[PDB]
Design an enzyme around this catalytic site. Structure first.
Site, PDB file in Angstrom:
ATOM      1  N   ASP B 158       0.851  -1.202   0.000  1.00 41.60           N
ATOM      2  CA  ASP B 158       0.000   0.000   0.000  1.00 41.60           C
ATOM      3  C   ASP B 158       0.891   1.258   0.000  1.00 41.60           C
ATOM      4  O   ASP B 158       0.646   2.215  -0.704  1.00 41.60           O
ATOM      5  CB  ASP B 158      -0.888   0.082   1.258  1.00 41.60           C
ATOM      6  CG  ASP B 158      -1.733  -1.161   1.554  1.00 41.60           C
ATOM      7  OD1 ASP B 158      -2.561  -1.562   0.734  1.00 41.60           O
ATOM      8  OD2 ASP B 158      -1.618  -1.666   2.724  1.00 41.60           O
ATOM      9  N   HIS B 186      -4.275  -3.184   7.194  1.00 42.58           N
ATOM     10  CA  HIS B 186      -4.098  -3.533   5.792  1.00 42.58           C
ATOM     11  C   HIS B 186      -5.432  -4.047   5.247  1.00 42.58           C
ATOM     12  O   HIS B 186      -5.680  -5.254   5.170  1.00 42.58           O
ATOM     13  CB  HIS B 186      -2.973  -4.560   5.617  1.00 42.58           C
ATOM     14  CG  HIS B 186      -2.795  -4.992   4.202  1.00 42.58           C
ATOM     15  ND1 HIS B 186      -2.416  -4.115   3.192  1.00 42.58           N
ATOM     16  CD2 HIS B 186      -2.978  -6.189   3.616  1.00 42.58           C
ATOM     17  CE1 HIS B 186      -2.325  -4.777   2.051  1.00 42.58           C
ATOM     18  NE2 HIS B 186      -2.662  -6.031   2.274  1.00 42.58           N
TER      19      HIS B 186
END
Ligand SMILES: NC(=O)c1ccc[n+]([C@@H]2O[C@H](COP(=O)([O-])OP(=O)(O)OC[C@H]3O[C@@H](n4cnc5c(N)ncnc54)[C@H](O)[C@@H]3O)[C@@H](O)[C@H]2O)c1
Lengths: 320, 313
Positions: B158, B186
């Site tokens: 990410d 996450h």
């Protein structure tokens, strides 16, 4: 003093070797950890969405060296200004094909691409063919450039055969592979290849001394991968492609030669001219040189007859 | 001696992309030999043998040994680094509670195995989802025998996505961008944050949704989930942890939340901006805008607490 990213094309870039190969190039494994690179990714028109997905994942790696990615189905776009081309694009052998059928299917790919390389690539472009039949595809590519591509700059990859042989020799000797060098894969990238350990060493010791079915295991290894994996090699083939190019550009280590399928004009072994043929090579200043003296006389040369004959038959099958 | 590195889920596509990077030296550097211990489920043993065969065929000078197994105790025996890519497969229409329960079985067994036989200073990163909670399960299952500062979860994919996107929006090379932050879980509640990011030496609509939606975009294009880029991120996560982050750079890591400077609740694996030095992270303070800044994290906190409870922790 040149600051521009080096332009590298990869064909077959939507395939499994491509997937394993492109992150290696982008991370610096091909040209070095401080050399900016531009990737030009070529595949077929139906694979454009897939190529977009490869581009997206490359973006998501945030690679500092990756200056630009271009994805395309047009070889004229892919090869525009390129210095290095790694040719993995070739359709897979289908059930029921003879070797001749595979050659005839993939031949058109390499005629078209050789013409395009000649039309738009950099004058000093170096090519390695991975896609099968590799040696003959390389020959086709070279001949299709109508004299505009340096014959010393078109090669075919036997480095996966070579690396497999280095590893098998290391395992048989119980030594670290880092110490093993100078196996030779002669001839065709096929079952007629001649894996040769007669000149191989561990450090500088002849390998024969450290060992208290070799040819058959090397020749059989790709089929073994398929048996275990359900698919042909990709990780290891990408790795070998990087090795082939890296040694070509950066040089072979001191005292070391590596197997490369190279154009056979003026070779020191008496092998017929006009073929792409795997020989032991050193590389220096971007150029290969065939190492002489590594066959045992006329006995040694006779060892190559079958592979020479196969390559000559393939050349005829290619219309060359 | 070679550093012993375990990779779980090693027959999967992340593992296929990851193992050659480790073997080539990208994880621990150009002069550190490695031993790879590859774990997957017992029906994947033949596939693992194929992975091993290809690794052999690479003739990697740093790769001292490969072991393949379906026994976690075998895989983690003496290991210093464990990269956990294996997790329970999601099935369309599965409840979150069920998914967390099924992953808790995997990560409990693996945490117990790590505690039993890994090296005393073993460092773990969990990649497989739900990554934060899986990491927490693993830590809690280790019977107090595993340093809580040595169990992490990966938000680096990410993070790298956010670096790239910010670079593309600014029209600059990604090498000039740093210090984006991915806070929290996450998951879709991650908070991608560019408020502290720098382009060159200059402080930096749809940014958040693009980062959150990127995995699904890959699947739309590829037909399969990310693999190359996840493997690359796992290497970054571990490499930066062990080697250190460069001066002025922080990276996102899911880390144990006790004693964080942001008043986030204890007892969670939570993504924070971190510097690293010599195998140790430090959370960077001061990167949220007061109490209003802290409120940005409420939703992801709540999700992580919900997942912890549903996992049976
Ligand atoms: N040692 C070696 O030299 C070695 C080792 C392994 C595989 N191979 C060969 O390498 C090739 C690639 O293997 P793979 O497993 O990645 O196969 P793959 O089928 O996954 O990928 C091949 C790709 O080539 C593409 N392609 C077809 N025509 C093209 C064209 N005109 N231009 C560009 N791309 C085109 C296909 O669409 C496909 O995406 C195969 O021929 C395989 O047999 C060689």
């Amino acid at each position: 003093g040149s600051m521009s990213a080096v332009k590298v094309a990869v064909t077959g870039a939507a395939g499994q070797i491509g997937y394993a190969l492109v992150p290696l190039i982008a991370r610096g494994a091909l040209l070095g950890p401080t050399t900016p690179v531009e990737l030009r990714l070529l595949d077929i028109e139906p694979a454009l969405k897939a190529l977009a997905g490869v581009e997206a994942e490359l973006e998501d790696c945030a690679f500092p060296l990756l200056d630009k990615v271009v994805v395309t189905a047009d070889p004229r776009v892919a090869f525009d200004g390129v210095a290095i081309a790694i040719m993995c694009g070739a359709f897979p052998r289908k059930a029921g094909m003879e070797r001749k059928d595979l050659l005839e299917m993939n031949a058109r790919i390499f005629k078209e691409q050789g013409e395009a390389i000649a039309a738009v690539a950099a004058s000093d472009c170096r090519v390695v063919v991975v896609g099968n039949p590799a040696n003959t595809n390389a020959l086709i590519l070279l001949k299709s450039a109508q004299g505009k591509l340096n014959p010393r700059h078109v090669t075919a990859m036997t480095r996966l055969d070579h690396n497999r042989a280095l590893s098998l020799l290391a395992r048989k000797a119980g030594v670290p592979v880092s110490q093993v060098r100078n196996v030779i894969i002669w001839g065709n990238h096929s079952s007629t290849q001649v894996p040769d350990t007669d000149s191989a060493v561990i450090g500088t010791t002849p390998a024969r001394e450290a060992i208290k079915d070799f040819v058959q295991v090397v020749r059989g290894r790709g089929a073994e991968i398929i048996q275990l994996r359900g698919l042909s090699s990709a990780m290891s083939a990408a790795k070998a492609a990087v090795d082939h190019v890296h040694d070509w550009i950066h040089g072979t280590p001191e005292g070391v030669y590596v197997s490369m399928g190279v154009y056979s004009d003026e070779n020191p072994y008496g092998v017929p001219s006009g073929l792409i043929f795997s020989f032991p090579c050193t590389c220096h200043a971007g150029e290969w040189t065939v190492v002489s003296g590594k066959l045992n006389g006329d006995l040694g040369k006779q060892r190559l007859a079958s592979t020479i004959a196969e390559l000559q038959e393939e050349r005829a099958q290619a219309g060359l």
